[PDB]
Amino acid sequence: GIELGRQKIGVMRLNNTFVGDRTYNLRDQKMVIP
Protein backbone atom coordinates (compact mmCIF):
# COMPACT_ATOMS: atom_id res chain seq x y z
CA GLY A 1 0.00 0.00 0.00
CA ILE A 2 3.02 2.23 0.71
CA GLU A 3 1.52 3.68 3.87
CA LEU A 4 2.95 4.80 7.20
CA GLY A 5 0.50 6.14 9.74
CA ARG A 6 -1.31 9.11 8.25
CA GLN A 7 1.08 9.49 5.32
CA LYS A 8 1.89 7.63 2.15
CA ILE A 9 3.68 7.73 -1.16
CA GLY A 10 2.01 7.40 -4.53
CA VAL A 11 3.83 6.29 -7.64
CA MET A 12 2.29 7.75 -10.76
CA ARG A 13 3.49 6.58 -14.15
CA LEU A 14 2.72 8.88 -17.00
CA ASN A 15 1.50 7.16 -20.11
CA ASN A 16 0.90 9.88 -22.66
CA THR A 17 3.84 12.15 -21.87
CA PHE A 18 7.33 12.55 -20.44
CA VAL A 19 8.55 13.46 -16.99
CA GLY A 20 11.26 16.09 -17.20
CA ASP A 21 12.24 19.18 -19.14
CA ARG A 22 12.83 19.48 -22.90
CA THR A 23 15.99 21.20 -24.03
CA TYR A 24 17.01 22.25 -27.52
CA ASN A 25 19.34 24.59 -29.33
CA LEU A 26 18.72 27.38 -31.80
CA ARG A 27 22.18 27.85 -33.21
CA ASP A 28 23.67 30.27 -30.73
CA GLN A 29 21.21 29.81 -27.86
CA LYS A 30 19.70 27.13 -25.63
CA MET A 31 15.99 26.85 -24.91
CA VAL A 32 14.30 24.97 -22.07
CA ILE A 33 10.70 23.83 -21.76
CA PRO A 34 9.52 22.93 -18.23
Binding site: G1, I2, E3, L4, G5
Partner: protein, 41 residues
Protein backbone atom coordinates in the same frame (compact mmCIF):
# COMPACT_ATOMS: atom_id res chain seq x y z
CA UNK B 1 14.75 8.47 7.75
CA UNK B 2 18.39 8.22 6.73
CA UNK B 3 19.22 6.59 3.42
CA UNK B 4 22.70 6.00 2.07
CA UNK B 5 23.66 4.46 -1.24
CA UNK B 6 26.15 1.61 -1.34
CA UNK B 7 27.34 1.03 -4.96
CA UNK B 8 29.60 -1.86 -4.08
CA UNK B 9 26.62 -4.19 -3.62
CA UNK B 10 24.15 -2.17 -5.70
CA UNK B 11 22.07 -1.55 -2.63
CA UNK B 12 20.55 0.99 -0.29
CA UNK B 13 21.09 1.40 3.43
CA UNK B 14 17.90 2.51 5.16
CA UNK B 15 18.07 3.57 8.80
CA UNK B 16 15.00 4.24 10.93
CA UNK B 17 12.27 2.49 12.89
CA UNK B 18 11.01 -0.92 11.92
CA UNK B 19 7.91 0.61 10.38
CA UNK B 20 9.90 3.27 8.56
CA UNK B 21 12.23 0.69 7.07
CA UNK B 22 9.32 -1.50 5.98
CA UNK B 23 7.66 1.51 4.40
CA UNK B 24 10.72 2.31 2.32
CA UNK B 25 11.20 -1.36 1.47
CA UNK B 26 7.85 -1.49 -0.23
CA UNK B 27 8.55 1.74 -2.12
CA UNK B 28 11.73 0.28 -3.49
CA UNK B 29 10.00 -2.90 -4.58
CA UNK B 30 7.43 -0.85 -6.47
CA UNK B 31 10.11 1.07 -8.37
CA UNK B 32 12.63 -1.77 -8.99
CA UNK B 33 11.22 -3.16 -12.27
CA UNK B 34 12.70 -4.62 -15.47
CA UNK B 35 13.11 -2.69 -18.72
CA UNK B 36 12.56 -3.68 -22.35
CA UNK B 37 14.94 -2.88 -25.17
CA UNK B 38 14.33 -0.53 -28.06
CA UNK B 39 16.19 -0.56 -31.35
CA UNK B 40 16.25 2.64 -33.34
CA UNK B 41 16.96 2.87 -37.04
Amino acid sequence: IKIVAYPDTNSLLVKGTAEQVHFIEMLVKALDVAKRHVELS
